[PDB]
């Protein structure tokens with residue numbers, strides 16, 4: 001029946017870390033004459049504008065920056081959400097206060113700054129502080145592998161807060177993320193499942209476990225297609241939609 | 243007697259929070275034909291370039307952003323220091339740990355992120371967090387006047403860290419600075435002292451006790467002059483050097 005194509009941005013519509021080409025932009029505008037199209041990415045609206053152009057909301061039926069916490073439909077804001085509004089200020093502060101006190105008790109070779117980075121979709125917590133140098137990240141990650149600093153911190157947090165519907169995810173060298181359950185790319189699906197689409201295709205290049213596309217790829221509401229590069233995506237769309 | 247004029251920037255060479263005028267810019271360049279000139283300010287190099295021009299290091303013999311923690315002479319960057327190398331990692335962490343535990347206990351309407359910002363010459367500490375929105379900044383600021391949050395925080399820190407060689411200074415709306423004794427504007431004098439100048443003039447608009455020019459003004463190494471406005475600075479310079 002009616003259908004929607006949903007695309008990851010970076011690595012799917014664009015070369016990794018790169019802006020969309022005029023030829024790809026032209027392709028999608030011709031594809032949009034056949035099927036509705038939308039884009040979803042983890043970055044804020046400003047970066048999405050850098051990757052796809054400042055007129056992004058006019059070129060796609062849906063634009064979902066920040067995994068859909070910001071949502072545009074047919075050119076106007078459909079909806080906006082953030083962690084403080086959803087969790088409430090009290091719980092935000094309990095979580096922040098617990099982390100600050102915990103980090104004050106961690107014995108480390110070095111502590112710097114930005115221990116708590118507040119983002120609309122998550123809190124990124126770092127015992128050493130995100131401001132540390134690359135050399136200092138490596139020192140910390142080596143201590144962390146031997147002492148399980150982040151593992152233990154996250155375990156204690158799961159015991160204290162997870163009944164409030166919070167997921168904790170370790171990643172990289174120095175930090176972990178705290179965010180409400182399901183606030184990955186799947187969040188955007190709430191904004192399209194009511195609009196009467198019989199099939200919602202999803203194209204992404206990080207569909208395997210740990211990738212930022214895995215949960216939306218696996219969700220039963222999407223017909224997921226893994227792609228290796230934008231050219232692989234365009235070859236699949238030629239076979240699917242002529 | 244070869245001499246040097248050191249100028250505070252904001253309120254002294256420029257109107258408060260504004261770029262220098264082309265008229266004042268031409269005046270200082272004519273003054274440079276008779277005497278070496280230099281600028282000092284607490285802001286970073288980018289802000290100094292915004293106020294005085296991207297070619298500032300070419301237009302002024304000395305440029306001392308961040309009170310001189312970053313220092314240019316004749317267009318080239320000088321020998322550098324930072325707070326963790328001067329204070330030691332142990333004192334840095336005791337300061338950071340104490341501040342983190344204290345912030346955890348403060349009752350605020352809202353808390354966000356970047357509670358501690360690690361800078362070259364200071365630790366900047368915000369009870370609400372530097373990443374807060376403008377509305378949240380004003381909200382906290384009005385609360386701080388009523389409840390004296392920053393003032394009590396700083397009073398407690400002066401007791402806990404007595405004799406460790408630290409200085410604490412509340413500024414702006416949301417934060418206070420912790421820096422080593424003497425790393426106010428006086429810091430830059432290390433780069434001009436005993437370097438051939440019989441007189442080091444200094445001009446500043448906040449030379450009163452509590453002002454960010456007080457210590458450099460009262461330092462014996464400088465012939466200090468208090469100015470009431472950029473036009474008053476020009477009056478004194480025309481008196482002294484014409």
Ligand SMILES: [Cl-]
Nearest residue numbers: 115116357358
């Ligand atoms: Cl922080």
Ligand SMILES: [Mg+2]
Nearest residue numbers: 008010011205
């Ligand atoms: Mg991707």
Ligand SMILES: [Mg+2]
Nearest residue numbers: 217218219222
């Ligand atoms: Mg699926």
Ligand SMILES: [Mg+2]
Nearest residue numbers: 250252253447
């Ligand atoms: Mg001033």
Ligand SMILES: [Mg+2]
Nearest residue numbers: 459460461464
């Ligand atoms: Mg003096």
Ligand code: NA
Nearest residue numbers: 189190191193
């Ligand atoms: Na729904």
Ligand code: NA
Nearest residue numbers: 286287288289
């Ligand atoms: Na800056």
